[PDB]
Design a binder for these strands. Sequence first.
RNA 1: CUAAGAAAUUCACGGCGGGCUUGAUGUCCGCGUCUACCUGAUUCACUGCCGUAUAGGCAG
Length: 187
Amino acid sequence: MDHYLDIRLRPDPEFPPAQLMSVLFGKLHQALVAQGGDRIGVSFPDLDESRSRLGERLRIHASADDLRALLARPWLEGLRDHLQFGEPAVVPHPTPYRQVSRVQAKSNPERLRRRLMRRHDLSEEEARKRIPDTVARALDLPFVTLRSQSTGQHFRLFIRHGPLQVTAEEGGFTCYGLSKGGFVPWF
RNA sequence: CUAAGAAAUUCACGGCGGGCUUGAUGUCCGCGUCUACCUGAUUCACUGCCGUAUAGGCAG
């Protein structure tokens, strides 16, 4: 994956950039479940780790045929007025390589309590005795908010840009474009 | 380095007895409250799955 395509959120008087970034990420995810495979990687070039902000840019990492297919496919319908685009081009080098991975946290003690009750046949009080409320961990990481279509929930999807490395390795990506082993050029 | 420097108010106690406040009364005419707006700031940290696990991961 030596090719990239930058997408920057146009400023909108109607919307904040986080809402636009989340609906763009959901539509990219739906485009990848429509496409299939594990070869599509994402990034956030104007990231702010300190303020936990994604920035205002998103960058896809793939081959050029994937970029020209995704630049005209109807997952960009209704956002071309919200979005300005670049051109499908080759990445610069030398670049450090890092991973973009979805991090999940045990954020609700009661759901894991109900799982322990389902898998150990305990009552509610044994689940509260075995699992306290200190267990709940909150991440200090930026996030998109996503509407599931299988189930009906709205959940925060916390992303982590991994450590910078001098070389990249093989692997795939999930249907959200996040690394389950793959690496992306970071520039 | 202070109108500086010091100090035991305290023992006891029956306030109760009794009573007619009454009659009478017109509130009342009148009234232009308009004008214009993003409740959305990621604001639903959720639901489940693997794992003996609370340790750690995974899905949408």
